[PDB]
Write a protein that binds this ligand. Structure first.
Ligand code: 9YU
Ligand code: I62
Ligand code: I62
Ligand code: NAG
Ligand code: NAG
Ligand code: NAG
Ligand code: NAG
Lengths: 537, 535
């Protein structure tokens, strides 16, 4: 060294790092990108829990994002911004267990609360290096230390032969836990406070945050949690051990690997792409919002089902922020329900609605399906194509996100937790999906991370002010367990969600509005009635 | 002797009586026999036409009430006593009443025929709230009402037997309808314009005449207030009617083929049968009645649901409707926690228990479905919400949703259908405020009782009653309740399956609404029948 920026050089447990000085709209931030936190889970380590990264020699260059975990790449609308913004933006590789750190420049004086991001992507996709997860704005404007990790997805992260030693399952969650242990040991070297760590994540990343809440070994690694449009409970975030075994065994057959040791050994000789090319083909029914390889209820990482664990756990110590976007379901309709396209209005027939309910609720018996169709039909206009389109969206969003979130918020609150709930209702002026899709799944993230502050990106001025308000809420929650500004009592206040009052806030361009009941009538259908109907039929 | 009060019908001569209505006199012919008294060997048998008589028969007073249970829940309280028999009880009760204008109509006049309710176990055409003088005087109508047998006497059935074939109380109604055909022209009535109207069990009876071909040639239009032939209480299967009759016979000590069983029942004094009438229901329930019309394959060739689903109604005009709180009345008669004397704020546990009583045929899963649909999950334990939800369950299950189903099926199969909800609560009502507008408390307005200054109704209620009398009689005259001379825009539109328009009847002008509890009635009419079948 000697000629380098002395404020970009840092030592962690594994050796010396060189970061890079990035420009944010209000000034510089420090980024340390591509820090390895595990041994590369390659070859004999495929499907195995991660091992801590062995120390390296010299100064590791941490100025660029590392490889994205090998994954399926979405090809539905090739070249369309609305899909490509989620696709891998670095080389696909099984050598992908790296994390990223953004801090103020120069690094902070006092120990600073840490935010750890866990990306979504249905547990089959995602990367911490995507533009919408850019930590520079929270670091610069709010002074936060922000960490994001890559974790294995798809078969590499979640293929399980439950009870085997060579594929115990949930190793993608163990990747996340190892990054959390890395933060505990090393974040102080960046000025981060290991005693104030807040997890946040969206969709499967939110479900992941919920699983760390529910898994004893993770609970000593963080203090507060944010779950955006996802829950560990609900119909897609976990599978039984029997179902995971069935899916792993079918996938093996499809790639030519007909005793668990021999089966897994043959799988480890298969090229990564061959596994990806058959991943989607093991689902038990025609479905949407269902993913082949997800966390497994193993009796280990998850000692029981999430529903059992949230129904009986002690959460006196927990502060959580949870919420949903306005149109959770619309995104999923164009990836499978006949009649839906991003390129037309998707006005569907009653027949297409019934067929779509079977795909969106693939576990429903005929009676359960008919119950869904009866609840969601508008009986003054039972065949109006616009209502049917919007009802199909609401079926998929309610069943997979809103009512699982309502259930989690209600159970956590009844069990001692401080819960804050929101609905996010603003549609980005820059959104490229059609207007009928409303505010789709995932389109609050760019506002939480403060992308509207980047002048290049063509957001409106009000969207810039809105983004800053949101970053305030999130970082205030990280700092204190309370999204409200300890000062500004003039601005309306965000009350806790309670079982008795069920209050939550609207997040849009106008000041906070408090509302009661998270789709309370409809979610009683999903959360109380439907399980008893399915058990009887 | 007043010649306006002397009439010759086919059976002989009648003397009526001149009555005072607020606007002038009316002619009343009360207590006209239309059948041989159904006594002794004729108990449980179809009625027979009245034999001719000599001289002038005195038709100046109401005749006996058909033998029936007398309600004793709140003795001496007007709200219950107003429905109790106001003449002596007798099985010799097959008489009818005719109100005409004074002087007798110069041209043939549309006829309204009232069929009273009372759950098929009670009722009488002599009740003060069925007083026909106001409709006759103000609207110039000819009004007819008949007594028909109720309880075991009208509906005890050993299906297939010769001595108790079932439905004889409905045959009583039909005989009176044919009497109107043969005789009403002598009073100035027009036998070619006959409108039936009735409430609760009487509306269900009107519906059953719609669905039985021999009655169709006896009337032209129909009004069904707060009751339907379809739905859970108005009929029983042949198998269940046989079970109840056999059980009642067991209870009164009658040991055996149908002939001997019915013979021993015929020896029992009337009160012996009434004493056990209420003891044969298969479950603890409300809004269920032991002896009601039976699907015999004769009067009712199939179930009302099958018949309204397949019938052709292209030349039928129907007016149907409900009151705002169909269910509240029934809660104080069985549901623990409910009383006319306190606000009946109930717990959640009492709500669950009430749903089993109010939907006595529901499985556990179906009862859970009802509870979860009617709970307000924003206030799941609020006593006021739970009370009002209990009322709504009973009213929707038994009246509102069956009415919506009938209106939609009739409209879809060519019928002209007009629909209403009645939302004015009488200023004179004696039931508590939490019961709202209870089952049966639109009748006094249709019949025009507010026009009597002595009953202390408000001036707005007099105006409102006149408006309703005009809807009903305009519908009787034309099949359309809209005034053919009122040219303002508060028009009552026909109910259709597409737009589902109905109107609210209250002190303010007609307002048009769409959808008669469409979402909730879809649960009752579409989902729950599939659920009870499956599990
Ligand atoms: C406007 O009132 C609607 C009150 O809905 C309560 C919803 O609770 C869920 C309880 O589950 C009941 C089971 O349902 C089966 C479906 O039947 C049709 C529902 O019919 C319309 C619902 O909108
Ligand atoms: C927000 C909606 N997303 C698209 C949803 C539809 N595609 C899938 O569900 C899917 C796709 C591919 C695989 C391998 C898979 N699997 O194995 O689970 C599941 C955005 C990219
Ligand atoms: C509008 C409600 N009415 C009262 C409802 C409760 N009583 C009954 O239902 C009842 C009462 C008696 C008998 C024989 C019977 N049966 O066997 O059919 C049913 C008016 C007072
Ligand atoms: C929209 O487009 C898709 C495919 O292009 C098609 O299947 C669907 O029927 C279309 N919908 C409408 C309403 O045109
Ligand atoms: C923003 O708008 C300008 C047009 O003035 C355009 O040239 C530029 O490419 C846009 N940038 C983005 C990110 O949309
Ligand atoms: C109303 O009174 C009845 C009898 O007096 C009683 O059984 C019932 O519990 C009371 N209801 C309430 C809500 O107190
Ligand atoms: C009407 O009110 C008066 C009291 O001013 C009373 O004397 C009379 O009996 C009341 N009539 C009825 C029918 O209640």
């Amino acid at each position: 060294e000697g000629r380098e920026d002395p404020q970009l050089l840092v030592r962690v447990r594994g050796g010396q790092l060189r970061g890079i000085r990035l420009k944010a709209p209000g000034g510089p931030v420090s980024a340390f990108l591509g820090i390895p936190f595990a041994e590369p889970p390659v070859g004999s380590r495929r499907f195995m829990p991660p091992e801590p990264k062995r120390p390296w020699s010299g100064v590791l260059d941490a100025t660029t994002f590392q490889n994205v975990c090998y994954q399926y790449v979405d090809t539905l609308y090739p070249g369309f911004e609305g899909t490509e913004m989620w696709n891998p933006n670095r080389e696909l590789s099984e050598d992908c267990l790296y994390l990223n750190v953004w801090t103020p420049y120069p690094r902070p004086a006092s120990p600073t609360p840490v935010l750890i991001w866990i990306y979504g992507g249905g547990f089959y996709s995602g990367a911490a290096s995507l533009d919408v997860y850019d930590g520079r704005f929270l670091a610069q404007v709010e002074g936060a230390v922000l960490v994001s990790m890559n974790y294995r997805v798809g078969t590499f992260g979640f293929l399980a032969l439950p009870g085997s030693r060579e594929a115990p399952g949930n190793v993608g969650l163990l990747d996340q836990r190892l990054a959390l242990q890395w933060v505990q040991e090393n974040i102080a070297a960046f000025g981060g406070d290991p005693m104030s760590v807040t997890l946040f994540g969206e969709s499967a990343g939110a479900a992941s945050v919920g699983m760390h809440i529910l898994s004893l070994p993770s609970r000593s690694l963080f203090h507060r949690a944010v779950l955006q449009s996802g829950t560990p409970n609900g119909p897609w975030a976990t599978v039984s051990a029997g179902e995971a075994r069935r899916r792993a065994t079918l996938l093996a057959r499809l790639v030519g690997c007909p005793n668990d040791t021999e089966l897994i050994a043959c799988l480890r000789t298969r090229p990564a792409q061959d596994l990806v090319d058959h991943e989607w083909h093991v689902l038990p029914q025609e479905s949407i919002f269902r993913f082949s390889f997800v966390p497994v209820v193993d009796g280990d990482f998850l000692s029981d089902t999430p529903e059992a664990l949230i129904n009986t756990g002690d959460f006196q110590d927990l502060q959580v922020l949870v919420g949903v976007v306005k149109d959770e379901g619309s995104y999923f309709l164009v990836y499978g329900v006949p009649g839906f396209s991003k390129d037309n209005e998707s006005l569907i027939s009653r027949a297409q609605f019934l067929a779509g309910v079977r795909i969106g609720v693939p576990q429903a018996s005929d009676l359960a399906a008919e119950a869904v169709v009866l609840h969601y039909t508008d009986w003054l206009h039972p065949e109006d194509p616009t209502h049917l389109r919007d009802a199909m969206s609401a079926v998929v969003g309610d069943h997979n996100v809103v009512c699982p979130v309502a259930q989690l918020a209600g159970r956590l609150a009844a069990q001692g937790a401080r819960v804050y709930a929101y609905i996010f209702e603003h549609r980005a002026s820059t959104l490229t999906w059609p207007l009928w899709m409303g505010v789709p799944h995932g389109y609050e993230i760019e506002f939480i991370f403060g992308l509207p502050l980047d002048p290049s990106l063509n957001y409106t001025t009000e969207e810039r002010i809105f983004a800053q308000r949101l970053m305030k809420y999130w970082t205030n929650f990280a700092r204190t367990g309370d999204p409200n500004d300890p000062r500004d009592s003039k601005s309306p206040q965000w009350p806790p969600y309670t079982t008795a009052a069920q209050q939550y806030v609207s997040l849009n361009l106008k000041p906070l509005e408090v509302r009661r009941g998270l789709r309370a009538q409809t979610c009683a259908f999903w959360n109380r009635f439907l399980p008893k109907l399915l058990s009887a039929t």
